[PDB]
Structures are given as structure tokens and as C-alpha cells.
Amino acid sequence: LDPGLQPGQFSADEAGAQLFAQSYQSSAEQVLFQSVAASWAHDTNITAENARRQEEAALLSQEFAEAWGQKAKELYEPIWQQFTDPQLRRIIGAVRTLGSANLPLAKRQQYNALLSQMSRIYSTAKVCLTCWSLDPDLTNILASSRSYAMLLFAWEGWHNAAGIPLKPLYEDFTALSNEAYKQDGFTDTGAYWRSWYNSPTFEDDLEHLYQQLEPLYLNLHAFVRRALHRRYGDRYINLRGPIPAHLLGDMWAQSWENIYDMVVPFPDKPNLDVTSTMLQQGWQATHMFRVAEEFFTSLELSPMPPEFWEGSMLEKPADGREVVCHASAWDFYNRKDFRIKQCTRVTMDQLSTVHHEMGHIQYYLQYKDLPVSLRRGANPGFHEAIGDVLALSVSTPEHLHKIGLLDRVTNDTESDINYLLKMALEKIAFLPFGYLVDQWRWGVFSGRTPPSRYNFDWWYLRTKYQGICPPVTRNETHFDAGAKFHVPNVTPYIRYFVSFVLQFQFHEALCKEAGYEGPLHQCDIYRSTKAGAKLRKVLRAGSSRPWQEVLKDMVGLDALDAQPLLKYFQLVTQWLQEQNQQNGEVLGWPEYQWHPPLPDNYPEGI
Ligand SMILES: *[C@@H]1O[C@H](CO[C@H]2O[C@@H](C)[C@@H](O)[C@@H](O)[C@@H]2O)[C@@H](O[C@@H]2O[C@H](CO)[C@@H](O[C@@H]3O[C@H](CO)[C@@H](O)[C@H](O)[C@@H]3O)[C@H](O)[C@H]2NC(C)=O)[C@H](O)[C@H]1NC(C)=O
Ligand SMILES: *[C@@H]1O[C@H](CO)[C@@H](O[C@@H]2O[C@H](CO)[C@@H](O)[C@H](O)[C@H]2NC(C)=O)[C@H](O)[C@H]1NC(C)=O
Ligand SMILES: *[C@@H]1O[C@H](CO[C@@H]2O[C@@H](C)[C@@H](O)[C@@H](O)[C@@H]2O)[C@@H](O)[C@H](O)[C@H]1NC(C)=O
Ligand SMILES: [Cl-]
Ligand SMILES: [Zn+2]
DSSP, rough: OOGGSSSSOOSSSSHHHHHHHHHHHHHHHHHHHHEEEEHHHHTOOOOOOHHHHHHHHHHHHHHHHHHHHHHHHHTTTTTGGGGGGGHHHHHHHHTOOOGGGSHHHHHHHHHHHHEEEHHHHHHHEEEEEOEEEEEIHHHHHHOOOHHHHHHHHHHOOOOOIIIIIHHHHHHHHHHHHHHHHHHTTSSHHHHHHHHOOOOOHHHHHHHHHHHHHHHHHHHHHHHHHHHHHHHOOOOTOTTTEEEEESSSTTTTOOGGGGGGGOOOOOSSSSOOOOHHHHHHHHOHHHHHHHHHHHHHHHHHHOOHHHHHHHHHHHSTTTTTTOOOOEEEEEEEEESSEEEEEEEOOOHHHHHHHHHHHHHHHHHHHTTTSGGGGOOSSSSSSHHHHHHHHHHHTTTSHHHHHEEEEEOOOOOOOHHEEEHHHHHHHHHHHHHHHHHHHHHHHHHHHHHHSSSSHHHHHHHHIIIIIIIOOOOOOOTTOOGGGGSTTTTTOOOOOHHHHHHHHHHHHHHHHHHHTOOOOOOGGGGGOOOOOHHHHHHHHHHHTSSSSSSHHHHHHHSSSSOOOHHHHHHHHHHHHHHHHHHHHHOOOOOSSSOOOOOOOOTTTTTOOO
């Protein structure tokens, strides 16, 4: 470690601890920056040399963490918890958490290489027939093909190509990750991930949320399954069984908005998918980002700085080099550089993703002057919620009309059902997936799911929660969990479930603050400076204060709560119950063992 980055002398008391934290931040920004920069260089240009550089950067970060972590303990271990300044206690708490820096050098090196190799494998996997990439090729097929055999080819090809080679690395990763956090005093990595919510009852609280949300999912599921049955036939759809996992518009069946055009309740009302209009009007990625930015500035939040536009990667590179296409937002910890990396496509769901990512950037812009350790969301679900809240306003037919993407719509009950149904495909269908992913990972980390049951337990959960089944046979050679970005890229997932509940609490609160008095799902907070001020107060707090308190100030309640989401969807929740009863649907999938057969002459789809 460079001398200028090493910790020096400080007194073993609170006053000294303040000075230690100031000294820490000065050097941490340099170390974090070099690490984020090397990660950027790799993820926008995947090569063995860039992985090597990233790995060296990670090693330096680990050296730094260890030196400052050990010094924190040397001076403050018995006293930091009784410090007067709550922000100081939080800073010291973070600094003393070493993570992978607890690993000896040889194991740090294995750990860092595993992360590189898992990232490479996922982001460069291809499906050959001249081969298709996940983004854009397989993504467009899953979104827009209504050919059972083509969808199957893409679903099978992707899961085989990405998942199988990841399995041995993922096992090695898991063991090292656990070894590292065990030395911070956590029984496994999952306990550490969960500790960020600062709640002894986290898992029970989640379960009780999902219990309230499940009926909305069951009804949406049954209604969609009926439509698929009419399209694909009794051979491939079982009206009392799980839906085949390739038919829902998304590689992971995690959100279903891309099959809206197959299930639209009232086809004679306005077309709520504005993708065609975007293309007809000549929208490009840059326009999509500018229109999102303008919504932020309408709220008197910050524009994107010049460094964002100059540094970001907003379209897939045409030199055809290898990149991580999965959308992400980047804080370089120098208070200057902030960037999005997205292989942007010109679609409505991508306009929402643009807002999701820019929500992350706005958080970074608002908390950039807090101590480095506090530059995080109040909890990670908050970070994921910000942009989605704005996107809820944007997606309203009234808002789409204002920005030229939809001829004005009537405000009749059919149009309302169409809209709420399209929104349910995006938000309600996700809920089970958002909840199950980290249930699988927590079980893997805890040892309840060994390698011998990775796929068995993954499909147990996928069926249990989503009511889906693999459309070709799978066995334990397959590692279907590895075919989802967040698994090989070690990004926790429960955040997204928390976010999907939390964003409706936020939405309600900001709509009320904007003085809006109509139905919650027709609220648009555009140009509400009062709403903007209320959101800003959250963003500026970072992780300086307990999230329960930040939430309380914002929404008047100190807990996650499903009622705002239930209120938003009420009309379509009722409509779907009634529709399914009229059709005599079974809610659920009691034929839990059912899987579809292979099509005739599959895979001869020349
Ligand atoms: C689409 O229409 C709905 C329904 O409007 C009905 O009620 C009014 C507006 C009347 O013109 C009638 O013909 C319509 O059928 C609009 O939703 C309603 O919005 C009004 C506010 O404009 C709400 O009134 C307010 O609600 C609460 C009651 O708790 C109070 O805080 C307020 O003082 C006020 O009473 C009303 O509740 C809404 N009705 C329903 C069924 O939700 C909606 O605004 C409109 N949307 C658009 C985009 O035009
Ligand atoms: C992608 O990364 C590679 C490294 O793997 C970059 O290669 C360097 O390119 C520079 C600039 O032209 C050359 O001068 C160096 O000699 C190259 N280094 C190596 C090790 O080959 C490449 O430039 C990157 N591409 C982009 C667009 O950034
Ligand atoms: C696991 O499955 C492997 C390949 O999948 C199989 O063959 C495909 C084409 C389908 O027909 C499907 O029924 C099968 O699952 C097999 O090569 C392999 O033998 C199986 N693995 C183990 C460990 O038994
Ligand atoms: Cl999380
Ligand atoms: Zn996000």
C-alpha cells in the first residue's frame, strides 16, 4: 500500500475517531476510484488484460480495507458503539467490516479471478444456430416472437450456454465468500447481505408482505395462462399446471409486459405500447436519456453532469467488441464522474429502464458530499426504487400524451383496466421472482442447498412462487440460476422485491405532496417542485440515518407496507378476480409436476 494511503496515528477516543474518519475518506476516494475505473474498463471492453487490471485494482482495494479496518479495531474496538455521533458510529462500523479483505492474499486472488471469470462467461455467452447474443438478439426474440419453437430454442440455448459453465466457479465463489464474511462475525454471506436492512425480523416481514401480494399474482397468472392456452393449445399449456417458462416475454419470465399484446383486455381502446411511435418518431438512446433527465430537472433535481454524457456507454458498441450489456449505474467516488452503462434499445420498457438507472445517478449526485461510507441508499431497496417511482408517472397515458407518445386517451373504465393490466404484467408478475432469487442464494450460502441440489432447489422455488416450469427437461448438469445476471455478477436481489413494494409507498407520498387528488394510478408528479423537495430529502440522507426513520419522514410510516401497491392496482385486482371466476379458472398450479412436451421436429427450425 502506498505510504500516502496508509493509516497513521490517532487518539483512542471519539475526537480521534472523527479525525480518523476524515483521514480515511481522503484516501478511500482515490482507492475506490481506481477500482471503479478499472471495473468500467473491463465491463465496457471485456478482455483478459482488462480483467487482470481490474483484479490488481481489487487487490489494492483489499489492502486498503485491511489496513484501515485493522486500525479501526486497534484504536476503537471497545468504544465505537458508545460514540456520541451516530454518523461516526456508522462510518466506523463500515470501516471495520473487511469482507474479502479478511482472506489471505492467495485466496483474495482466487476470489477476484472467480468474479472476473463468472462475469466473462455470462456476458459473452452465445447461442448458435453465426450466433445470437443475449442483448439484443435473444432479448428481442423472447419479447416479440409468438412462435413456440423459436422461443424454445432461445430459452434452452441461453440457459445451456450461460448456466452450465458457471456451476463449478459458483461453488468455489460461495465457499470463499463465506470464509471471508465469517471473519466479520456473520455465519454466512447471506446473513451479511441481510444485515443491511437492520431488522431482526426481516425474513418474517418479507414473508408477510408476500402473503398479502400472492392473490394478485395468482389471478394475473391464471388470466395470462388462459390467453396462452387459446394461443398455443392444450398440448403446450395446462390450465391447472405451471406455465412453460419461455412464453412470458422475458428470458426469466420475471416480467410480462412484452406479451401485453397477446392479453390486452380491451383491444379497441388506445394502444398503450408506445414502442412503435418511438421508432416512427426517430427516438434514439440519447433522446431517451434526455427525456428522463428533463423529468428529474422538472422536479428541481439535478441534471446529468457533462462527465455523465461524455463518459457513459448508452448504446451497445458497434465495433462489436465484448461488453457487459446488463444496465447499470456507476459512482466513481470522486464526486465528479457518474455514468450509465446500458445497451439501450428503442422500446417502452427500455425507457423505463433508463429512468431506473438515472434514479441511481440522481442518488449519487445528491449524496456525493457525505462521507464516503455513507454514500449508499438508506437501504439498497431505496436505491432501486428511485427511478421506478418517476417511471410510474411517465407511463401514465396522460404523461405519454404530454411527451407526444400517445394520442389522448379517454378516461373510461376499459382504458383504465388496459393500463392497470399492462402495469401488473410489469410489477405484479415480478413480485414472486424478486422474492425467490435470494431465497435460493441464502440457502446456497447457508449450505441448505449444496451443489448437488442447485437446480433442484432453483426449480422448486421457481415453481413454488412463479408457477412456471422449464419447457425442456433439466437435470443437475444444468445451472439455471447462473443464467440470470445477478447470480454470476454477485449482485443481491431482495432489494428489487423491497423496491417493488416501496416505490408505491413513495409514489403515494409524492402524489399527496404534489397536491394530486385523483386515483393513485393516474397521478403524474411531473413539474411538482414540492414532490421534488420531498424526494431530495431522502436522496441527500444517503445511509447517514436508519432507513425506518427516513421512510417515516417521507411517507409517515416506519415500515414496508403493501397497501399503497394494493390501492394502485385495486381496479384490475377486482377485474381479474371476476374474470377468472367467470371462466372457472383454477387459481394456482396444483398439477405441480406438469411439463410441456417437445414440439414436432424440434430442433429442426431451419
Ligand atoms: C378520470 O375519471 C375519474 C372519475 O371521475 C369521476 O368523478 C368526477 C371527477 C366526475 O367528473 C365524474 O363524472 C367522474 O366519473 C377521476 O377520478 C376522480 O377524481 C376526482 C378528483 O378530480 C376525485 O375526487 C377527489 O377524491 C377525494 C375523495 O376521497 C378527495 O380528496 C377530493 O376532495 C375529491 O373528492 C375522485 O375521488 C376520483 N374518482 C374516483 C372514482 O377515483 C380521474 O381524476 C379522471 N382522470 C383523468 C386523468 O382525467
Ligand atoms: C479494449 O481493451 C484493450 C485491452 O485489452 C485495449 O487495447 C489497447 O489499446 C490501446 C489504444 O489504441 C493500444 O495502444 C494498446 O497497445 C492496447 N493494449 C493492449 C494490451 O492490447 C483496447 O484499446 C480497448 N478498446 C477500447 C475501444 O477501449
Ligand atoms: C442431463 O441432460 C443432458 C442433456 O439433456 C438431455 O438431452 C436433451 C437433448 C433432452 O432430450 C433432455 O431430455 C435431457 O435432459 C444429458 O446429456 C445428460 O446425460 C444428463 N445428465 C446427467 C448427469 O445424467
Ligand atoms: Cl439487497
Ligand atoms: Zn438498479
